[PDB]
Each structure stands twice: as C-alpha cells, then as structure tokens.
C-alpha cells in the first residue's frame, strides 16, 4: 500500500515435528476454514511416505521443499508498444511461500485417489528433482533466462 508496510503473522510450531514449515503447510492444505480434515492429510502423509523411504520423515520432506525454491522469477513493465518481462531476484521469505503452494496445488493435479498419498507421492518424487512442482522452478527459470536481455530495465 502507499502509506508504508505492515507485519506478517507468526505461527507457532507443530506439536510433533517441531517446525513452522509444517504449520504453514496446513494453512496451504486447509480450505474453507477446517483445520480438522487438513491434519489427517498431513500426518497421514509423513507416515504414508516414511514407509516408502527409510530415512526420517522431515528430512525427506524438507528436501522436497528445497528443490522447489525458485531463485529468480519474472516481473513486468510497459514500453509503448511492448511490455517487457524483467527478471528480478527473489527474497528469502518469498521462496518459502511459493514452494509450499507449488507443492500443494500440484497435488490436486494428480491421479491418485485420496489426498493422503497424492501429497505422499509428491513429496517423494519432488525429492528427486522431478515432477510437476519441480519443473516449475524450471518453467519459471528459463523465463528469467530468455529475458536475461531485459535486465537493465530494473528497479
């Protein structure tokens, strides 16, 4: 807004895994205002995945949100007959908003049945640099490359 800036809202850790990267992933999972049926989907997919792969539940999830952290990205201006897409560098707290919704809306776009395991097959494929969520820090990373020419039009 014009007048200035504001804070955000600072959420207290999970009961169990003891991070705030799993409270801010329920707020991406929650919908319509129902934190009941979002905490089935998020503790039934740390142990629907913890079987499949024999290391911890939180180091195969937290490497599943660090292949997805887009480091560059495009923003726009106009010219007067063209409208060029500039590439800007991404802050250290916006890469954590996008990795966590590039992982949860690339899960309703999947052909499994119950979203215990869509979210479960997407934290284990995305841990190996592959599939849906983690081409999209690659969709979004040529566009900051193709446009490497228009960088001087920056702010």
């Amino acid at each position: 807004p014009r007048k200035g800036s504001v804070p955000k809202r600072d959420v207290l850790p999970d009961p169990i895994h003891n991070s705030k990267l799993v409270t801010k992933l329920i707020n991406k999972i929650m919908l319509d205002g129902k934190r009941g049926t979002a905490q089935r989907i998020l503790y039934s997919a740390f142990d629907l995945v913890e079987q499949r792969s024999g290391r911890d539940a939180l180091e195969v999830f937290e490497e599943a949100i660090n292949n997805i952290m887009p480091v560059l990205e495009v923003k726009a201006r106009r010219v007067g007959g063209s409208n060029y897409q500039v590439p800007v560098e991404v802050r250290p707290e916006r890469r954590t908003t996008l990795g966590l919704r590039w992982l949860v809306n690339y899960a309703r776009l999947r052909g499994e049945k119950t979203m215990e395991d869509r979210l479960a097959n997407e934290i284990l494929d995305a841990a190996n640099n592959t599939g849906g969520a983690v081409k999209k820090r690659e969709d979004t990373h040529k566009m900051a490359e193709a446009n490497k020419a228009f960088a001087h039009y920056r702010w």
Partner: peptide
C-alpha cells in the same frame, strides 16, 4: 537444470543503464 547462478551474472549487466551510456565518453 538451468544452474541458476544468473543471480550473480545479471548484476553486472544491470548497471549499464540507458543514461549511463549517454555519459562516459570513450
């Protein structure tokens, strides 16, 4: 991967403005 070290490389090319060229005769 695209190897996003461009963050380190599109910072020298950021400073050749449209008016920085107008000055600095060679």
């Amino acid at each position: 991967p695209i190897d996003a070290e461009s963050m380190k490389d599109e910072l020298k090319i950021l400073e050749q403005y449209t008016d920085e060229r107008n000055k600095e005769t060679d």
